[PDB]
Ligand binder design. Sequence first.
Ligand code: NA
Ligand code: NA
Ligand code: NA
Lengths: 236, 233
Amino acid sequence: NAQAEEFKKYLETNGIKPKQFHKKELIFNQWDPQEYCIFLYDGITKLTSISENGTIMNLQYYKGAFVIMSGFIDTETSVGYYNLEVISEQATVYVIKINELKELLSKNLTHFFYVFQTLQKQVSYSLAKFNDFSINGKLGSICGQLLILTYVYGKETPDGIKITLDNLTMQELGYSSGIAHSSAVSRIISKLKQEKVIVYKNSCFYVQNLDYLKRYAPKLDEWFYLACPATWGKLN
Amino acid sequence: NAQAEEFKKYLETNGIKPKQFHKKELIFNQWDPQEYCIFLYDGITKLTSISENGTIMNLQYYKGAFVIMSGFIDTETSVGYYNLEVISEQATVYVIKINELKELLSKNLTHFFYVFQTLQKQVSYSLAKFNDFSINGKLGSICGQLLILTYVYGKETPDGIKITLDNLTMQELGYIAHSSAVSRIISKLKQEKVIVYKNSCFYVQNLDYLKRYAPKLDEWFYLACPATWGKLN
Ligand code: NA
Ligand code: NA
Ligand code: NA
């Protein structure tokens, strides 16, 4: 990712050093009024909101390289009461107080535009997820998350396209698909195994009918085509 | 909206003339190879998509002043096969090809920040909507839509918060097109006197009910539009 590598160099040039966070840590949290720009260089995170009774809502997932901003660039105040939780074993992030970010994007407009484009990717991703759910419901949701994982992490094996993630849990897959309880995920994962679309072997999902996933997540497939054409092309 | 007025003046300063569109016209469409930045100065629009059947899906609504970009700012290519359709009688828009937007935002970072912040508001809005649907389902979505009409178009009166939007437009925004499930939810809120018809107008009489079932969109409006939130709270 050439833009992300150039942005990394720009940050280090300007004294911003990488930080390692481990699984379950909150890079930023919903109770902290100091807001941040997070450059997630490596690893997997999720945006959450925690209710007063302790229920955790999973709102969005991100993988490095990406940018997540907890405050508005102009007002420096919260864009929502959100946490950014590490779900990979480790994540590498560059943390920039929001008051400092304006200065930096101001002096290099190439990187201003790299960060702008990431917001556009979020917005359109959310719309595509909404569109697929409206058409195909929870099946579309789960098919879409399996599809993106296949594009990003898939490896061709004799067993199918293996999604090469450690501890890709049934529960985390449902959360990324907007489904909060395991009953609905089991029923759909059951149908997908029954119809021989996926298989579960060495703690990993293998995709054996990629066309089926594309069929039921058409707007997320189109999002990936439009936003990540080189990666989309590996399996089309 | 002071920031938006400054942006309008900056566009005109750089030679960009407003265009007028009418209800049901497309400001941009999903088939055009060229992408645009739309400064929607006045009016109401919706983002639409089409499945293979020819079925139209309503994805998002925008009211002036706002910024809608159909392509990525760096690559200038589509962010999605989307159309932008006018819902009000008329809309006033400024249309900027994406390559020219970058030159404009480069030269005045105040305006760069304005467009960047509007994109941040859009991102958080989508997440708030998703959070409220995930908690309260279609009731959360509908209460959220009604909550935004109340905050954006509402004025306090002795009969409640009058929605100061023409009745034609206001029925559309309350809501794929014309879901029976949505109609039943809306008419249940009316039946329960959350929103009431009186002397040719509609009045929100139970704002607390809307806030209860769209709590994340309520927080979004407090954080993103605090002065508009404050008027009615
Ligand atoms: Na925070
Ligand atoms: Na277009
Ligand atoms: Na107030």
